[PDB]
Ligand binder design. Structure first.
Ligand SMILES: C[C@@H](CS(C)(=O)=O)Nc1n[nH]c2nc(Oc3ccc(F)cc3F)ncc12
Length: 342
């Protein structure tokens, strides 16, 4: 049956939530206490979820994605609710997940982590990614700020969705530093391995305490990337479906791949080897999450029987054109059909 809701203004926003959620505090996301489960939770009220087709579809997309994700190392949905009693009244959507303490930045904080810390942290990211990728879902925007960790260094992947504007990808910004070159410059139709590029950047940063490719702009970042991994070979150049981008790439003086052991001085030789396998220019040749988990660097964490894959994820809706009310009705069904985890 329908729980009792109570009203409360917070972010100059009127929040109407079930009584079970108490002590709401702005952190449009609020920290709260779930009296039913005893969990500290984050409650997110979507703003204008059905204002346009694009926005309505995005609301549907986020809910579908969150409802599907059932893995230790991936953000899960604890609850989803609306104060509405019917489709006609339906206008607001609230999403509930675990309140995560801090992100990966707060932990790195300009400092080198121990090799054991790096092992454990990257292991969990790859474990989550294997899961995510097995459902043919690409994160597309993995960075330290989308990786939440608790006191015990237990990690969850957040975000996934919305996507950054051209303005916020411009200049000296962490929003672009972990992005694979093929997606940063739209070289081609990208695949799941864009995320592996991002993991390599993250891992290097955990090892050195420094951003791997802190480009001041797209062009500066590419030069930083190509200095490390070398300029593309003929094989890759053919794969760059963009004639314009291909032509610019060929304007650059050729450079060989650097010695990673000389770049990551003092680092575990197994970490160096993994980095070389993640940070490959040609995305076809990048190591996958499943393959990376079997790499000797994770010997003390790897367990083939404790690295689950996801149930199939039906994302046919992505290529579907619908009206606002149709995306809305679909979103409503998803809210109403939600079943809480054990
Ligand atoms: C405060 C923050 C610090 S942090 C980890 O981002 O640095 N911590 C968080 N823990 N959980 C979170 N969730 C969201 O957004 C949601 C996403 C999906 C939902 F179902 C519900 C949400 F509220 N935002 C932040 C956090």
């Amino acid at each position: 049956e329908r729980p009792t809701f109570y009203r409360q203004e917070l972010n100059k926003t009127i929040w109407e939530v079930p009584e079970r959620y108490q002590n709401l505090s702005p952190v449009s996301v609020c920290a709260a206490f779930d009296t039913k489960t005893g969990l500290r939770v984050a409650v997110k009220k979507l703003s204008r979820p059905f204002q346009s087709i694009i926005h309505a579809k995005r609301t549907y997309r986020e809910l579908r994605l969150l409802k599907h994700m059932k893995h230790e190392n991936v953000i899960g949905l604890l609850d989803v609710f609306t104060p509405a009693r019917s489709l006609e009244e339906f206008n607001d959507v609230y999403l509930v997940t675990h309140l995560m303490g801090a992100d990966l930045n707060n932990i790195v904080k300009c400092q080198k982590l121990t090799d054991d810390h790096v092992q454990f942290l990257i292991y969990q990211i790859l474990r989550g990614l294997k899961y995510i990728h097995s459902a043919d879902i690409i994160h597309r925007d993995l960075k330290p700020s989308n990786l939440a960790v608790n006191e015990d260094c237990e990690l969850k992947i957040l975000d996934f969705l919305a996507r950054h504007t051209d303005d916020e990808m411009t200049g000296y910004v962490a929003t672009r530093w972990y992005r694979a070159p093929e997606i940063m410059l739209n070289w081609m139709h990208y695949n799941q391995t864009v995320d592996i590029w991002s993991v390599g950047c993250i891992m290097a940063e955990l090892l050195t305490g420094r951003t791997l490719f802190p480009g001041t702009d797209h062009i500066d970042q590419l030069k930083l990337i190509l200095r490390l991994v070398g300029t593309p070979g003929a094989e890759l150049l053919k794969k760059i479906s963009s004639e314009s981008a291909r032509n610019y790439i060929q304007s650059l003086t050729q450079m060989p791949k650097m010695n990673f052991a000389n770049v990551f001085i003092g680092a575990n030789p197994l970490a160096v080897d993994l980095l070389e396998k993640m940070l490959v220019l040609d995305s076809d040749k990048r190591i996958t999450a499943a393959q990376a988990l079997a790499h000797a660097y994770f010997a003390q964490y790897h367990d083939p029987d404790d690295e689950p894959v996801a149930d199939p994820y039906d994302q046919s809706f992505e290529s579907r054109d619908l009206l606002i009310d149709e995306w809305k009705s679909l979103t409503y069904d998803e809210v109403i059909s939600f079943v809480p985890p054990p």
